[PDB]
Amino acid sequence: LHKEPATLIKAIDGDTVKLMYKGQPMTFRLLLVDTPETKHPKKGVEKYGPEASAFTKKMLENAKKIEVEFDKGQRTDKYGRGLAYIYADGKMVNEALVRQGLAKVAYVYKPNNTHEQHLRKSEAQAKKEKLNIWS
């Protein structure tokens, strides 16, 4: 696994972001995490949805360097979104969301599961501290 540089274009949701990656605009979906929805009219704005989106936005907007990390499996989903681990100045947004209790560790599909243990460890901590989702 290796990181590649990307440039932010627009944060769309806690778990979905648009980046410029190798000269092309691309929508990225954050691997292994599910943040509460602000979009989908299924229901509307779930609780901590606006909070998760603001966290992702801020972390990405205030960064010096953004990097995308592809996992070992397929690199895009059926909607055409890149599937990756996103890093803001060396810190993984995916993990930070979970550690802050703003995201669940999603259903994991091998072999796209390399940082799974790390994230479930972070989700257990957030559960212990009863943060946001877990309170």
Curated annotation (Swiss-Prot):
Residues 115-135 are annotated as: Disordered. It is found in: Secreted. The active site is at residues 29, 37, 81. Residues 115-131 have a biased composition (Basic and acidic residues). Ca(2+) binds at residues 15, 34-35. It comes from the Bacteria. Coiled coil: none annotated. This is Nuclease A. The lineage of its organism: Bacteria, Bacillati, Bacillota, Bacilli, Bacillales. The gene is nuc.
